[PDB]
Amino acid sequence: TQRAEAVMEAEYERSEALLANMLPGSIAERLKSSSRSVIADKYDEVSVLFADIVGFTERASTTTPADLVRFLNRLYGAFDELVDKHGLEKIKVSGDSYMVVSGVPRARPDHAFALADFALDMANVAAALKDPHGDPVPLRMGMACGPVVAGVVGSRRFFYDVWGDAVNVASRMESTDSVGRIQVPEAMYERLKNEFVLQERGRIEVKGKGVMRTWYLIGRKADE
Amino acid sequence: TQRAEAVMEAEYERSEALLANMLPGSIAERLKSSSRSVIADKYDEVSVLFADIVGFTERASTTTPADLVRFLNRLYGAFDELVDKHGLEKIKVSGDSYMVVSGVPRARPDHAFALADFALDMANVAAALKDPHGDPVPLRMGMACGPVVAGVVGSRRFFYDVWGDAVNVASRMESTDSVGRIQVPEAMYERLKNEFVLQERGRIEVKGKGVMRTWYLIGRKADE
Ligand SMILES: CNc1ccccc1C(=O)O[C@H]1[C@@H](O)[C@H](n2cnc3c(=O)[nH]c(N)nc32)O[C@@H]1COP(=O)(O)OP(=O)(O)OP(=O)(O)O
Ligand SMILES: CNc1ccccc1C(=O)O[C@H]1[C@@H](O)[C@H](n2cnc3c(=O)[nH]c(N)nc32)O[C@@H]1COP(=O)(O)OP(=O)(O)OP(=O)(O)O
Ligand SMILES: [Mn+2]
Ligand SMILES: [Mn+2]
Ligand SMILES: [Mn+2]
Ligand SMILES: [Mn+2]
């Protein structure tokens, strides 16, 4: 029975390790509580980041669809290493778009700073990496902070997603960005300007907000 | 020892039941195994659908953020039962977006017809129901077909997903679609046209493909 008792726990360890990989800590437990209630938690202030590969579909002429997924897995493996180093939250991946959130599931007041350190690190990572044909991997990166709702929707193939205004403006900060830069709205610049160094881009038209003044994040302030 | 076995059996069962709903079973094993290969399998003939709710962010003015998440779970959970009815593959609910696939894991000659019957059924069920404020639920829908790659990318937050040209043009079919219509490209039209009624929209600009002749799925043909 020991040859089965040890194997049942070895299979439990593998199962728990997968669930852990796919879901944040508290979320996996909530989904095993066998609570019929839905997971929708309000968060007062979180920072969200989107990073998106510049001209990914043009690569479909020189690269096969399977090698493009092998590319994504390689590049995301490098980014996943970086999210663990910074202790942040990877939410999801939408093709060539990588979403990282700071301040969920465990809220933290320095969310903005931590994501800003992350974005600058991510910039240095992609800058060092080559696509399937030895060429560079250009990125558009945008951030935003604010009230968000995080939770799990649906009965199958579910994940912990986050919804809110800050995901909507961070999405625009990324799409409206010039390749190689980290774009932030006026609201985040206000949060960052004390510890970070930023360059004013100017006015920008948002797809659902209107017109905003934007800033580019270049690095931490010199400690001297 | 007696009470120890009683709880440990149940805990093992929670993880397995949770895990069962989270991924296709054989990909969960490939993920629990020590394989260094990319979980990426090529599939020839698959149809992909993208749905997205029209003006979701604006509903936050009348509905609380958590009731919006509860709504998304009520709405897409209803469609989750419709995918099963049609024997298709739900990929995810991301933001207010939904991805359903036809032709993975098992290939079916009617992959395009089965997903077209599903989208039309989905458009009828959405039309028959209200949002929490009592207003209608207008959707944008896009469909496409062709060779696809299905699997998992990255080392953290494993999620079973689908990539390819079909998922690229289905997302553009949805984003560029008029509200309440189901948009498909010329290639998809050419597949459906002998069992379904289609109306040409015409040549429209789509990102990464140029100018495409698009159509609107209207409904099934009168079998006399
Ligand atoms: C033959 N095409 C592919 C083969 C293998 C893997 C991916 C593709 C592919 O075309 O991926 C694209 C979308 O399907 C894929 N994609 C986007 N959203 C989703 C999504 O939500 N799900 C999946 N599975 N794939 C998605 O991302 C890719 C890039 O989309 P963007 O919209 O970001 O544009 P871009 O070419 O990079 O130029 P630009 O953005 O700088 O203007
Ligand atoms: C204050 N906003 C909210 C409060 C509670 C619940 C949801 C929201 C909200 O705005 O959710 C949006 C994103 O935060 C949330 N979201 C989560 N992840 C993502 C993501 O990766 N991308 C985007 N764009 N949005 C995301 O999805 C939601 C819908 O996004 P869309 O841009 O598709 O819809 P729309 O702009 O309302 O209308 P239309 O253009 O479709 O007509
Ligand atoms: Mn891109
Ligand atoms: Mn993208
Ligand atoms: Mn929407
Ligand atoms: Mn969306």
What letter does residue A153 receive in the DSSP assignment? Answer: -
What residue ranges define each of the domains in chain A, with the CATH number in brackets?
1-224 (3.30.70.1230)
Counts for chain A of helices (H) and strands (E), in that order: 6, 8
Cα B97 to Cα B175: distance, rounded to the nearest angstrom:
11
Pocket test for ligand 1, best of B94, B168, B174 (most atoms within 8 A of CB): B168
Instruction: Collect all residues of chain B within an 8 Å Cβ-Cβ radius of residue A87.
Output: none
Question: Is A121 known to sit in a ligand binding site?
Answer: no
- For the residues of B182-213, what is the DSSP string, one character each? EEEEHHHHHHHTTTEEEEEEEEEEETTTEEEE
Cβ–Cβ gap A95/B163 under 8 Å? yes
Q: Burial letters for B4-16: b for 16+ Cβ neighbours within 10 Å, e otherwise?
A: eeeeeeeebebbe
* Token couple for A6: 């040890």
Q: Where are the beta strands (DSSP E) in A20-178?
A: 39-53, 89-94, 97-102, 139-152, 161-164
Chain B CA closest to residue A32: B14
Backbone angles phi, psi at B54, to 5 degrees: -80, 130
Q: In chain A, positions 182-201, which contact chain B (CB-CB < 8 Å)?
A: none
Residue pair B93/A174 in contact (Cβ under 8 Å)? The answer is no
Q: Where are the beta strands (DSSP E) in B96-209?
A: 97-102, 139-152, 161-164, 182-185, 196-206
Residue with tokens 């498909």: B184
Residue pair A142/A98 in contact (Cβ under 8 Å)? The answer is no
Cα A80 to Cα A98: distance, rounded to the nearest angstrom:
10
Would you call B25 an interface residue with chain A, using a CB distance cutoff of 8 Å? no
Residue pair B69/A52 in contact (Cβ under 8 Å)? The answer is no
Cα B85 to Cα B65: distance, rounded to the nearest angstrom:
31
What letter does residue A136 receive in the DSSP assignment? Answer: B
Question: Is B52 known to sit in a ligand binding site?
Answer: yes
Instruction: Write down the experimental method used for this entry.
Output: X-ray
* Token couple for A204: 């920008």
Q: Which positions ≥6 away from B81 have C-beta within 8 Å?
A: none
Residue nearest to atom 19 of ligand 2 (CA): B95
Beta-bridge partner residues of A98: A51, A93
Residue with tokens 């590319």: A71
With H, G, I as helix, E, B as strand and everything else as coil, classify residue B68: helix
Closest by CA position to B119, among listed B105, B96, B148, B140: B140
What letter does residue B109 receive in the DSSP assignment? Answer: T
Residue pair A91/A162 in contact (Cβ under 8 Å)? The answer is yes
Residue with tokens 């990929």: B91
Closest by CA position to A51, among listed A194, A217, A205: A217
Q: Report whether residue A144 contacts ligand 2, using a CB cutoff of 6 Å.
A: no
Residue pair B216/B181 in contact (Cβ under 8 Å)? The answer is yes
Beta-bridge partner residues of A216: A183, A199
With H, G, I as helix, E, B as strand and everything else as coil, classify residue A82: helix
* Token couple for B123: 């458009």
What letter does residue B136 receive in the DSSP assignment? Answer: B
- The residue type of B91 is I
Cα A170 to Cα A110: distance, rounded to the nearest angstrom:
18
Instruction: Collect all residues of chain B within an 8 Å Cβ-Cβ radius of residue A208.
Output: 57
Cα B139 to Cα B49: distance, rounded to the nearest angstrom:
12
Cβ–Cβ gap A155/B21 under 8 Å? yes
